[PDB]
Amino acid sequence: VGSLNCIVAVSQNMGIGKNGDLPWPPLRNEFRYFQRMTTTSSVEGKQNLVIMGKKTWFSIPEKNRPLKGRINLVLSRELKEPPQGAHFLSRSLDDALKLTEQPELANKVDMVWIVGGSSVYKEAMNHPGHLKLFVTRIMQDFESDTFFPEIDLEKYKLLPEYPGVLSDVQEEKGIKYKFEVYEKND
Ligand SMILES: NC(=O)C1=CN([C@@H]2O[C@H](COP(=O)(O)OP(=O)(O)OC[C@H]3O[C@@H](n4cnc5c(N)ncnc54)[C@H](OP(=O)(O)O)[C@@H]3O)[C@@H](O)[C@H]2O)C=CC1
Numbered sequence: 001v002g003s004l005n006c007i008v009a010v011s012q013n014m015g016i017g018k019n020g021d022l023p024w025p026p027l028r029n030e031f032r033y034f035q036r037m038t039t040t041s042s043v044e045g046k047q048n049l050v051i052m053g054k055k056t057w058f059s060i061p062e063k064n065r066p067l068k069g070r071i072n073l074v075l076s077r078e079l080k081e082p083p084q085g086a087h088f089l090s091r092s093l094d095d096a097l098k099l100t101e102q103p104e105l106a107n108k109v110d111m112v113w114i115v116g117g118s119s120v121y122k123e124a125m126n127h128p129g130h131l132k133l134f135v136t137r138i139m140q141d142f143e144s145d146t147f148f149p150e151i152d153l154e155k156y157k158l159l160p161e162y163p164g165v166l167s168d169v170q171e172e173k174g175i176k177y178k179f180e181v182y183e184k185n186d
């Protein structure tokens with residue numbers, strides 16, 4: 001199994017969601033970036049795995065659900081089986097990562113992408129080992145009711161560029177944003 005990663009888009013006030021949707025209006029190219037980064041795998045005969053909490057799963061409109069071309073895993077202790085359209089269900093983050101090593105998935109999964117929400121991000125980020133964060137900084141404040149956990153910059157280094165990630169300011173619907181990649185190894 002290849003690398004472990006988180007990917008998020010976050011306002012200046014650290015918001016990632018409001019009422020089960022994003023705090024900002026739809027940013028089509030931002031979403032295209034999320035789909036590209038999470039779907040593209042350099043290893044022949046493998047797909048990437050996306051890991052998400054239950055409320056994030058149900059935030060994806062049925063049209064984009066499961067995320068196509070990726071294996072979709074949902075975290076929940078209440079659910080008894082994967083939701084309609086999902087592929088896997090685990091009861092903890094550690095369980096989901098252990099599962100990638102089982103015979104059913106060990107030779108099928110390339111990268112692992114944690115796609116939210118706030119508790120899953122927090123636990124992924126505080127878990128020893130090699131981890132990258134792909135963070136889109138939406139450069140305005142937006143009313144939110146979720147939030148991204150604190151990024152400890154003593155351990156997460158902001159990389160000075162990264163292949164396949166544009167380094168300059170983007171703008172859609174009058175909202176400027178930029179792409180960042182952070183890496184820790186502890
Ligand atoms: N980049 C972005 O801007 C992103 C935005 N979002 C937004 O964030 C919001 C959803 O996030 P949030 O409210 O944080 O919720 P989550 O997606 O984290 O869902 C939480 C539910 O998931 C299950 N859960 C979470 N972590 C675990 C765990 N480690 N083990 C087992 N079960 C777990 C629990 O279910 P149970 O109670 O069944 O056990 C929990 O009640 C929405 O507004 C969505 O639009 C989401 C992702 C990215």
Ligand SMILES: COc1ccccc1/C(=C/c1coc2nc(N)nc(N)c12)CC(C)C
Nearest residue numbers: 007008009021022031034059060115116136
């Ligand atoms: C348009 O996206 C949404 C709309 C409504 C509810 C949830 C989302 C999602 C959010 C993001 C998770 O990591 C993300 N990372 C980045 N860089 N951008 C994102 N947008 C997400 C996931 C996809 C829908 C499946």
